[PDB]
Amino acid sequence: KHTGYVGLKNQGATCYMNSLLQTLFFTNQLRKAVYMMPTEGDDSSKSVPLALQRVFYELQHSDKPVGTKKLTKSFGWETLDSFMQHDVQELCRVLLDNVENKMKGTCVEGTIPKLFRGKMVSYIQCKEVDYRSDRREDYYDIQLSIKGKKNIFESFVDYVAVEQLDGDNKYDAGEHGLQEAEKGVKFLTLPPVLHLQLMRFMYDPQTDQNIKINDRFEFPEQLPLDEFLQKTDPKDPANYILHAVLVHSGDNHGGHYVVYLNPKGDGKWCKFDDDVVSRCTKEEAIEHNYGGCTNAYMLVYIRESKLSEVLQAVTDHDIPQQLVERLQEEKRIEA
Numbered sequence: 001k002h003t004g005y006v007g008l009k010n011q012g013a014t015c016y017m018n019s020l021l022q023t024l025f026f027t028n029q030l031r032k033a034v035y036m037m038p039t040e041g042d043d044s045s046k047s048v049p050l051a052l053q054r055v056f057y058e059l060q061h062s063d064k065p066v067g068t069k070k071l072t073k074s075f076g077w078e079t080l081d082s083f084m085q086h087d088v089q090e091l092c093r094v095l096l097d098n099v100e101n102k103m104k105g106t107c108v109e110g111t112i113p114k115l116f117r118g119k120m121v122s123y124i125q126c127k128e129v130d131y132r133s134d135r136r137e138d139y140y141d142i143q144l145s146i147k148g149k150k151n152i153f154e155s156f157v158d159y160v161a162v163e164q165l166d167g168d169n170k171y172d173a174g175e176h177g178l179q180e181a182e183k184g185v186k187f188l189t190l191p192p193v194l195h196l197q198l199m200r201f202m203y204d205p206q207t208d209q210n211i212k213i214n215d216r217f218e219f220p221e222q223l224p225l226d227e228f229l230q231k232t233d234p235k236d237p238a239n240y241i242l243h244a245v246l247v248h249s250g251d252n253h254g255g256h257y258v259v260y261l262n263p264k265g266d267g268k269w270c271k272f273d274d275d276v277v278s279r280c281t282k283e284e285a286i287e288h289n290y291g292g293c294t295n296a297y298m299l300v301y302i303r304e305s306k307l308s309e310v311l312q313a314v315t316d317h318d319i320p321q322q323l324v325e326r327l328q329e330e331k332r333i334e335a
């Protein structure tokens, strides 16, 4: 613990979970809200809220590597298969929807959407008939296409690019028949905490297989996103600071997962390799994970205007006495 930070017990079958837990743990405002959840009546093994409270508590207090057994147990993913068949954002939705449900009716209701939810609009516009379809969506995460793209900017460019629906890919416009159309996405808001997964896998139609992309893909320390909003705010530009880089090395049937974090948002990074946390260069965290067998697959950015609120200090006093008492008894039960 000479970095000041403690690790989690060896990933084993749990894959990218440890990576995500450190990422969520250092989303300080989330952690604080998780501690405020009223778990007093919950079961010590089947409540996900309580097991996440306990992991966060141990990450904050333990000098030894922290275990996740009760947490994996609590949501029912106890096999290499359960982790392998899902992606990291699905695990994140599992944890965060469990937590946001428990916060309903409390002083911390709305924490999850406050931090992580943004708003987009999808459209289809017919060019030759007066028909348009609009769909407003919430999103908690973005999946960016990387194949052929050099950087995050070009992925965003591609994400909001307008597609023509013509030829064989005519839009079915109902009573208007098959119609030539455009479709696009536009962002209306970007969240305080921006979760970007990079599409390191895709089905490719020419080869007829799901392909891994191991190409170089560059991501900045500072990400300006005003270009991609439908209306920018001059009082609050969408400027983003890189907080976390989740990385995989090696085999597509196992391999190894690590996360690089700069917890305070200050450009001083550590590598979290399960039980070993170590100081690292910025270059190790960022450039050396660009690729092109060691691939970044998830980036977390925090908005500059929200940085001090999201990464507010947490002290031991910020954990409710009820919960400390519970978790201390639940540690005495372990001896």
Ligand SMILES: O=C1CCC(=O)N1Cc1cc2nccc(-c3cc(Cl)cc4c3N(C3CNC3)CCC4)c2s1
Residues within 6 Å of the ligand: 016, 083, 084, 085, 086, 087, 088, 089, 143, 197, 198, 199, 200, 201, 202, 248, 251, 252, 253, 254, 255, 295, 296, 297
């Ligand atoms: O690529 C796609 C297609 C759909 C999507 O959201 N993505 C983005 C990802 C999210 C995600 N979440 C967790 C782990 C990965 C992942 C990254 C690499 Cl570089 C290699 C291996 C991965 N897994 C993955 C866990 N499932 C396979 C194991 C194989 C090696 C990924 S990749």
